[PDB]
Amino acid sequence: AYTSHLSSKTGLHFGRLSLRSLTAYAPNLMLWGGASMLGLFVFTEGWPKFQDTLYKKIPLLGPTLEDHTPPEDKPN
């Protein structure tokens, strides 16, 4: 028939932030969290605790990080 009005809604927002932009931006900042976690995996590679807990269980880059210096040629 003939439209006399405009039935609308507002939804949810708190200023500049909506939920529609949160839906549009959610998977790419999941990817950003993954990217900076890989950056942490870079920047803590010389750390020994993160080596012996995380970086030496890689199936081909595991034995690359350790010494097997014998317990014979180091003073401590």
3-class secondary-structure state, position 31: helix
By the criterion CB under 8 A, which residues form the site for other proteins? 7-11, 13, 15, 18, 20-21, 24-25, 28-29, 31-32, 34-35, 38-39, 41-43, 45-47, 49, 61, 64-65, 73, 75-76
Q: How far apart are CA 62 and CA 64, in angstroms?
A: 5
∠ Cα 27 33 46 (to 5°) = 155
CB of 29 to other proteins, least distance (A): 8
Residue closer to other proteins (CB basis): 11 or 71: 11
